Amino acid sequence: TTMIDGIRTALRSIGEGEISISAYDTSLVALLKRLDPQFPSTIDWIVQNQLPDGSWGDASFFMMGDRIMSTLACVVALKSWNIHTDKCERGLLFIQENMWLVGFEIALPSLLDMAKDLDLDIPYDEPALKAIYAERERKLAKIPRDVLHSMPTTLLHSLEGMVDLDWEKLLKLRCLDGSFHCSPASTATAFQQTGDQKCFEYLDGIVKKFNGGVPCIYPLDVYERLWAVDRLTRLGISRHFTSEIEDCLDYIFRNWTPDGLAHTKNCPVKDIDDTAMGFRLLRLYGYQVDPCVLKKFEKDGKFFCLHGESNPSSVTPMYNTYRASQLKFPGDDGVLGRAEVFCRSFLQDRRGSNRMKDAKDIPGEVEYAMDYPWKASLPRIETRLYLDQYGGSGDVWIGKVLHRMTLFCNDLYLKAAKADFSNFQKECRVELNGLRRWYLRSNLEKFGGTDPQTTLMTSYFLASANIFEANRAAERLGWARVALLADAVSSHFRRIGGPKNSTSNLEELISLVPFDDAYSGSLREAWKQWLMAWTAKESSQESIEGDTAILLVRAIEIFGGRHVLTGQRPDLWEYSQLEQLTSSICCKLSRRVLAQNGESTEKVEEIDQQVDLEMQELTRRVLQGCSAINRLTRETFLHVVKSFCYVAYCSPETIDSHIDKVIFQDVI
């Protein structure tokens, strides 16, 4: 409990960003001379963050580009100000011996050229040096200088290595805070070249905000929120921070642009990674968002990361787009349709290859996203897996320096999640152990599977994988119980021929569900209808699965005790229409599992193609958080259907390997 409050106070205090200080950008800001050093606290930061091998940068992850480039950039500060020559050469040793990332081949050449303007014994004569110094010109050539001055671009992030540019038409391109694409390095060098006080103002605040020392990117108010939400959400503890999450999710909605989302509010250049993350979470949490904001990253069928700079697209952004395409609504622009296909192909061509590199388990995160589309993504399934995939402090981010995200790439995030999940597994085992008794002492295993522990186990598991909450135990057990009766009864009819020869008064049977003073009567009425559905759908070809599901949501709605006001006309329609979809969607599923007869891949792929279709209009009506039906009622429909889909799209082998991994393979 203390931990939840820990994450809460961290989220309530959300802001510009929790980022690690970058050694390179801090010393490059140290290089700015008094307006009459200008930030002696940049230097005061520098002296202390020296690693024992005499080097700099990220300590916990050793990277060549990072330890070298961060180390020397601190050196070019200490010696060019002729102070602390003790550590200055002590780290000059590190550079010499280990001489054998973003903007690396642009900021490093201007940093050696800057190393020449001082004296510093460093192997410039490196065979590795010529290969990346050649790419200096291999890129400064494909960049059109007259285009770098016309529209804000990703290049403006590396102006320390840029030579002889028109600042008259460049200051027109900065971010809203005055920064040059949010690099303090690019703004320091832009200030050495022009004294724009709004371009200074970005810099001083960044050092004031950190009491010395400055990161490699700022601010990142959007990226951080979006990703902190997705992370808490996947970890299953999102329910604890509902006001805080909906607090900053609002912020993302406020700053939605028709051109997409950037990593910060005040960056005019947008990227697909942030837009897809934003689009998914905004739609997932019930906001009105239009996916057409994506066609800004489509150029002739292909999907890049920036609007124009057709760079090679990385792996993580395509994952995040693929996920956003999974919340496809039928009324949406086709761009989301095209996006799904492209991103699936991108990640499939790469799945069978270790070319999944960009974080702890990025292939596992991706296998899931591809093997379990939305219709079959049960939140506890994803969450159990995600505990074994979330990197914690292990995740590192590739910027100008190696940097880390304090707020959402946290170790407290895991300790909290694995706690809340263990208590779920504990509450789950006691839950079913109580269920097993209930099943047996009812002469109820005589009906059902030829191994009723298996028909019980999956029937309880589905309900708990979806309605997993602490207190919602009333509903969960109700779902499991009613499910078992329905399975039992369907089994009895299947090997007897129908209610035609129902010798018994099997209406009763609900009295196997314990009497609640508010629950029992209405549950009798719903169960009566499921029976009445059998005798009518009996001597025909329509399946009953549609009505089995419809009964379920009816009970789950009786437990948990919310009713649908029926005087209001649109309240009636939205409910009555949700039932139609669930009745229709589960009936089509039961037709696919019959064609798996077992022949015609062409025919099965037709049924799948249209179930996905009807699922979209359901997913729309369930998430559309303005609809006149209670969000919990809407979730109840989504829960039942997803579980039905889950079952219909999964081998019994895969299904209980999940059961073992979520309920029994204890975390912590």
Added chain:
Amino acid sequence: TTTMIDGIRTALRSIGEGEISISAYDTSLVALLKRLDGGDGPQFPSTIDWIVQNQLPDGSWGDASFFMMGDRIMSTLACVVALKSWNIHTDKCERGLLFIQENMWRLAHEEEDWMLVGFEIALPSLLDMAKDLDLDIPYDEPALKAIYAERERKLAKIPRDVLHSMPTTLLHSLEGMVDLDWEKLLKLRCLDGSFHCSPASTATAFQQTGDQKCFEYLDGIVKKFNGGVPCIYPLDVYERLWAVDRLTRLGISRHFTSEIEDCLDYIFRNWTPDGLAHTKNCPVKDIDDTAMGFRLLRLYGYQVDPCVLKKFEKDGKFFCLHGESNPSSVTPMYNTYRASQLKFPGDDGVLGRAEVFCRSFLQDRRGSNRMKDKWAIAKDIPGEVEYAMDYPWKASLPRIETRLYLDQYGGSGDVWIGKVLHRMTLFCNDLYLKAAKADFSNFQKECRVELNGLRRWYLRSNLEKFGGTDPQTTLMTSYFLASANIFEANRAAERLGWARVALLADAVSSHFRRIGGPKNSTSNLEELISLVPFDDAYSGSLREAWKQWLMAWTAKESSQESIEGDTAILLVRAIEIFGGRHVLTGQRPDLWEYSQLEQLTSSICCKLSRRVLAQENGESTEKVEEIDQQVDLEMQELTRRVLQGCSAINRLTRETFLHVVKSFCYVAYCSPETIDSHIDKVIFQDVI
């Protein structure tokens, strides 16, 4: 002390197919089976590996600690005709071949009921092997002429076409049978493939059919015992049911609640509409297992239908099997009678018929020393029945039965009569007695301790001033009733509280006789309740319960009606105040079920207070028998509601009702002479 319990728990946790002793007869008769591939060695070399080992020093085979002719003869000779037919260890072969010669004359002294199964069917068939191989043995015995002719008498009684039409008990011992029609017979065996769960009967069946599903039973029987084989297997139902019955009556059922419930579940799953067998996979069912299963299941709060018994009714009599009208034994009729005690008013009539019939069968059998059993043999078989016969459910107080049962449990003493003598390791245990006699002694020790506290409390409270004109026995009995029922270690809170409050009521009642009623109540008998110790949670609601009891006095006073009803309600109200259980009255049927329990106890106890007045007034035996049935009926409806695990009120709340009432019943149906012989046998008659 607690250490012994943990052994029993570990035995129960690993319950399974059965812990039974090996039969010498069945073991060698399986050695006689030749390889499936023709190898000139026996198919089961470990069946022999056992034989050489377990030859007893007296030169015989069979049960060692219990000497029986039938067992020594068949077990030895079957081992010998094995040893010679494989021509090995012929040195030991005679070291017991001698035993047959010397003790052969003890067969004319067999007991009228103690006789092996298939004795006259598998043994004459065992002599025939003692003549295909030459065997030096005394065929001419005066005991043989009567039993050898009993072979044709019984193989003239069997209907050949019916032995092949429906599975029967004859299928158990068919090794000495001719007329082999397996085409129509193999369709009659068990789900195991075994013939009525006998490995002997399956050895004969395999030479005569290469049935690999019939071998599979035999291969398994020797794997699971790594050599050697009993005379009946498996016993998954019998063992559980009986393992339960034993631990229950020994009063230590309380510790193994999870273990019992697990294997009692095994019965509920494997219940059939045709009854219970000794195993899951035997199609011919028996009343002994069926009555035990119904009784234990109903006792433990399961939904069971007694009409499963009418499958054993043939024209007013009950036998043991379906249709097959046989010499009924005593223990199966005992066990049915016990099950008949739990009749609910809604039950099928068979429980009515079962009780009355077995009542006669066990009465007509009680005097004559025909109390010997034809199936079982055990320390005290008539004592078990004497109790069950003298003390019906309404007066069978758990510590009374358990104390008495301690001196009648056989331990290792029990032996069971199959084709050979066998014993049940798990359930016919000596540790069972070792543990129970301990747990009971710790109970009486704690009972004596509480008594001194009650004695002090009674004396010092000036409460003897009025009341029963011999204080010391009013306390002693009144505490006994509470402790006989609510006896647990930790429930001392309730037990003492029950006994204490009871004393107040009796005291207040007597004062009311001496003044003529609350009309002449000069006193403030209300605040008499603060004589109970003051816990902050117990009293004051306790005061309110007491206040209501007095209110019963003044309101029923201008009438004739008894108050024993309201005094019984007052106790259960009190016992419930102790132990601190409340009735969530938000839920309606809980309120109803409680409110009706109060009615039934108040009602049953008033009738008791009217019957004991017609026994003072010496009124027509038939008039008292009118009241006894009218009480017994309500008792069933209460016993239904107390044991039905459906309607939701804490089981302890329901049991508290049964406890108060059962104590009232015991008192009204028991002589004061008999009553404290019980007090002494349970509290003061030290065990160990």
